[PDB]
Amino acid sequence: VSVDPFYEMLAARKKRISVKKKQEQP
Numbered sequence: 001v002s003v004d005p006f007y008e009m010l011a012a013r014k015k016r017i018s019v020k021k022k023q024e025q026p
Contacts, residue, residue, distance in 0.1 A: 009015040016022075
């Protein structure tokens with residue numbers, strides 16, 4: 001059940017992309 005909400009994360013690389021880290025200033 002905990003892997004379900006993590007599927008879109010591990011599977012879709014959009015996760016690390018939508019990260020607030022990238023939203024910050026370089």
